[PDB]
Amino acid sequence: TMDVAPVILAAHRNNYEILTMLLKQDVSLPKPHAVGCECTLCSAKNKKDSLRHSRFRLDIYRCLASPALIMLTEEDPILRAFELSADLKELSLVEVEFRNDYEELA
């Protein structure tokens, strides 16, 4: 898909070597918005392309939920896993259309 960066796909295939060479190149993913963020951008992207925005959010939260990216770039992987599981459960509560995927990532 056109919204997928190499580091997001690298986190999708969950390989530690590809991660440990890719993050050496100073790579940062976009920050996903909140559970109910309806700002000037978030209310406009849903108007623009709802499916593209939903797939971008799912790809980002699949990239962050990989164990390799948690264990490489965070101060506390246990705390990041806890917060990410809680956030993913809340998103699966909110996002009715992709309950199985967000529940699986949690």
């Binding site: 530690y16 164990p67 264990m71 506390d76 992987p77 246990i78």
Partner: protein
């Protein structure tokens, strides 16, 4: 498991309230015109269906099918045959759509549900037991009802050492399990055919 199971019952009683509400409306519309008063006495009589809350009371006790409400409550005191027979048919249809249909549907739903919880049963029980244990681990209230900074940096450094060790061990264990669990697919066969053909072509080119 029963505490997890109660939501199925919540949904089933949500449907049963609407079914009960329909018949209660039908019976108290049919029997409205026609000592002990009501249903809670020896001679149950026709006064069960006179009031709306009395009709809900009478149709509440029919679900057990154990002679809680005798069928002479459906007989008119004025002796009208057709209204009494239609009331009997209505209460029979209630005893069919419940007891015979809804209760056994509930039994099937609970059978599938208890098949579903039972695999994640020990983990849930241990989690609830640990919740109670950590509720009782505090020094906040030890009596029964009737009686009722560089150190942070050192702790963070110790935690970083322990977590670095844990990350190393989990990475090694994850790659060990990954290499010992996945099955070979046809694409790996295709790479092996490629290596064989590349051998054969290099042999032909060299010789």
């Amino acid at each position: 498991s029963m505490g997890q199971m109660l939501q199925d019952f919540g949904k089933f009683l949500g449907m049963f309230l609407l079914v009960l509400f329909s018949f209660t409306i039908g019976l108290t519309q049919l029997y409205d015109k026609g000592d002990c008063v009501g249903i809670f006495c020896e001679q149950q009589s026709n006064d069960t269906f006179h009031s709306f809350i009395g009709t809900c009371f009478a149709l509440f006790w029919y679900i057990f099918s154990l002679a809680h409400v005798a069928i002479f409550v459906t007989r008119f005191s004025y002796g009208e045959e057709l209204q009494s027979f239609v009331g009997a048919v209505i209460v029979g249809t209630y005893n069919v759509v419940v007891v015979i249909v809804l209760t056994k549907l509930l039994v099937a739903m609970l059978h599938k549900s208890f098949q579903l919880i039972a695999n994640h049963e020990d983990k849930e029980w241990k989690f609830a037991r640990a919740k109670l244990w950590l509720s009782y681990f505090d020094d906040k209230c030890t009596l029964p009802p009737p009686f009722n900074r560089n150190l942070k940096q050192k702790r963070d450094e110790n935690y970083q050492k322990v977590m670095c060790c844990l990350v190393h061990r989990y990475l090694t264990s994850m790659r060990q399990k990954m290499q010992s669990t996945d099955q070979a697919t046809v694409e790996n066969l295709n790479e092996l055919r490629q290596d064989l053909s590349k051998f054969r072509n290099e042999i032909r080119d060299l010789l």
